[PDB]
């Protein structure tokens, strides 16, 4: 693919963790990424579903200090199933090859290849381009990290209304601490 | 009952910096989604920058390029737009508008509008 | 972005449609779209919003669809006072708006 479409990025925004929620930082649901194998997976499936106390915050924390560490965020579909996702959105569109770090207060949009050196990331998952758009994003991280970094994404279905009951916001937060 | 009252419009030195302010009243501001619009007088509408009731999320048309701040004060119920490096192009008529949503989805009630002029 | 007819005309009955094509990305993309009226002189009015719907006092002549990429305002028995601008304007993701070029209505007789 060119050049022009990998490096896509959107600077002409900005956003926090809570979003447009009221939800404060105290109130965020924080669990860890599932370890499976190698694999550190933020599920937001579940999670994310119309719950009659939405919306909440739902934080996944992917915390790595291992080489060679494979993340995989699974961000559940539009119209996946009926009415559970139908205003669900996602940030950044060109995850994972477009993040979100904080600058200052707010999130804003970072390539990042350019934010860690060796990234390795595959233009597809399972046949699926490698895009919230196919549900899935997967990248993978290099032998050695010289200085720690963090970054974000959003999958956000608190617009989604069922009833008496609202969608989640989901963050994911990555945290490479500095390994090899 | 809803009115919205934009100031600070005028004439600019290309480069130079405007900034628009709009007080409202007759609706409850801080649980509003609030656009900024501009119209130049011979053209259509032209959307440039929206701010959440929380300013969770704020957003800005392709044109502005980093030139632009929108802000908002809750508490005495006013939005602001900071415009630096005015260009001619940006020579237009700029509308205040809240929204149906406390996200940004629909301008709702609009405003009179203010006259900016870019010109040497 | 939106690109919308330049002019439509009528006589007071007659119907009027008026086109308004997007992207994958912003009207095919959400149903978050809305129509506003704009008289000579004055400032926009909210006709539709979410697609479909109506605000209170519009009057039900005033209907709007969508289709894929395109959505379209129907005036049904237009009347003079229909006679104005008007825009379309949709969610285009990320928390930014589009609008729209604007099409001018113009009642015969």
């Known amino acids: 693919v060119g050049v022009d479409e990998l490096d896509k990025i959107d600077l002409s925004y900005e956003t926090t963790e809570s979003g447009d929620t009221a939800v404060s930082e105290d109130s965020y649901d924080k669990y860890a990424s599932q370890n499976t194998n190698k694999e550190y997976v933020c599920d937001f499936t579940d999670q994310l579903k119309p719950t009659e106390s939405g919306p909440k915050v739902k934080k996944c924390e992917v915390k790595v200090n291992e080489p060679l560490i494979k993340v995989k965020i699974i961000c559940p579909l539009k119209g996946s199933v009926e009415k559970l996702y139908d205003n669900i959105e996602y940030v950044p569109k060109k995850s994972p090859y477009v993040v979100l770090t904080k600058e200052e207060t707010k999130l804003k949009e970072k390539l990042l290849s350019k934010l860690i050196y060796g990234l390795l990331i595959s233009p597809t998952v399972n046949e699926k381009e490698n895009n919230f758009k196919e549900g899935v994003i997967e990248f993978t991280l290099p032998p050695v990290v010289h200085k720690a970094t963090v970054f974000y994404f959003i999958c956000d279905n608190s617009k989604t209304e069922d009833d008496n009951k609202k969608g989640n916001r989901g963050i994911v937060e990555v945290y490479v601490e500095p390994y090899g | 009952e809803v009115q919205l009252v934009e100031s600070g419009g005028g004439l600019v030195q290309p480069g130079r910096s405007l900034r628009l302010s709009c007080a409202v009243s007759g609706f409850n501001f801080e649980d509003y989604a609030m656009h900024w619009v501009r119209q130049t007088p011979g053209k259509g509408l032209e959307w440039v920058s929206g701010?959440?009731?929380?300013?969770?999320?704020?957003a800005y048309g392709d044109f502005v390029q980093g030139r632009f701040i929108i802000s908002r004060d809750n508490a005495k119920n006013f939005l602001y737009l900071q415009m630096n490096s005015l260009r001619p192009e940006d020579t237009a008529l700029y509308y205040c508008?809240?929204?149906?949503?406390?996200?940004?989805?629909?301008?709702?009630?609009w405003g009179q509008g203010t006259l900016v002029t870019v010109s040497s | 972005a939106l690109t919308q007819p330049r002019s439509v005309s009528g006589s007071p009955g007659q119907s009027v449609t008026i086109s308004c094509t997007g992207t994958?990305?912003?009207?095919?993309?959400?149903?978050?779209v809305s129509w506003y009226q704009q008289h000579p002189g004055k400032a926009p009015k909210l006709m539709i919003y979410d697609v479909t719907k109506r605000p209170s006092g519009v009057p039900d002549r005033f209907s709007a669809s969508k289709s894929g990429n395109t959505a379209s305002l129907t005036i049904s028995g237009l009347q003079a006072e229909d006679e104005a601008n008007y825009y379309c304007?949709?969610?285009?993701?990320?928390?930014?708006?589009?609008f729209g070029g604007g099409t001018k209505l113009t009642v015969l007789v």
């Open positions: 508008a809240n929204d149906r949503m406390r996200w940004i989805q629909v301008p709702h009630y």
């Open positions: 304007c949709s969610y285009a993701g990320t928390y930014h708006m589009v």
């Open positions: 994958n990305d912003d009207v095919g993309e959400y149903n978050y």
């Open positions: 701010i959440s009731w929380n300013s969770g999320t704020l």
